[PDB]
Design a protein around this ligand. Sequence first.
Ligand SMILES: C=CC[C@@H](C(=O)N1CCCC[C@H]1C(=O)O[C@H](CCc1ccc(OC)c(OC)c1)c1cccc(OCC(=O)O)c1)c1ccc(Cl)s1
Length: 128
Amino acid sequence: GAPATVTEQGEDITSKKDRGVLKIVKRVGNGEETPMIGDKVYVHYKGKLSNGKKFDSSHDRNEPFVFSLGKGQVIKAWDIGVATMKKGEIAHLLIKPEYAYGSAGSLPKIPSNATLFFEIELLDFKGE
Ligand SMILES: C=CC[C@@H](C(=O)N1CCCC[C@H]1C(=O)O[C@H](CCc1ccc(OC)c(OC)c1)c1cccc(OCC(=O)O)c1)c1ccc(Cl)s1
């Protein structure tokens, strides 16, 4: 499973090194530049529970998912994870609850203490 590969071979990109966010690069993006705090980022993604018992995908709006990086507009794992991504890159993230919704969850979609999995494609990013 794509999740299993991230467990075994994913890099811990957390500052605390608690394996709360693990990452594999599935397709290399271009150049060296990755986005700074405050950059506008454009992604496609899809996501599911570590189980997969729930599943959701941006693509259904053929328009990109857009947010300002590093400003708390998304769960912590995304501010951490998307920051490490290059233009055109596709990555897998496996995320412990503490970097997502925690024990609060986000019912009824996301239960308490849920692990999440995402495939993210970084389409572009532009400066504050
Ligand atoms: C419809 C389900 C939501 C989806 C999900 O978990 N996210 C959507 C993509 C981005 C990551 C993550 C997320 O940050 O959810 C957030 C949920 C709200 C939120 C934001 C910031 C948070 O912490 C700083 C936060 O903490 C619990 C929750 C989200 C959803 C939709 C849009 C958005 O920002 C752009 C905008 O507001 O226009 C942000 C999942 C998909 C599959 C899953 Cl399993 S979980």
